[PDB]
Amino acid sequence: KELRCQCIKTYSKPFHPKFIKELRVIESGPHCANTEIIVKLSDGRELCLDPKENWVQRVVEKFLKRAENS
């Protein structure tokens, strides 16, 4: 339950939020100096995204709005 940084790299090409089915956002803290954003894609693969990129912020928000609305 208490893990060091889970991401070794972030995925740098924008993609459409339709391909995200689960999101985890882990704020920085003693476990990891960086906030980590980990997405699970439709097919089950997992990648990490740079929380500072605008496109990332927007994709996460679009996923959240869709998920919240069922």
From Swiss-Prot:
Effect of K65A: Impairs heparin-binding activity and leukocyte transendothelial migration
Organism: Homo sapiens
Recorded coiled-coil stretches: none
Parent-record interval covered: 30 to 99 of 99
TM spans (from-to): none
Domain of life from the UniProt record: Eukaryota
Record note on what altering K62A does: Decreases heparin-binding activity. Impairs heparin-binding activity and leukocyte transendothelial migration
Name of the featured protein: IL-8(8-77)
Disulfide bridge map: C5-C32, C7-C48
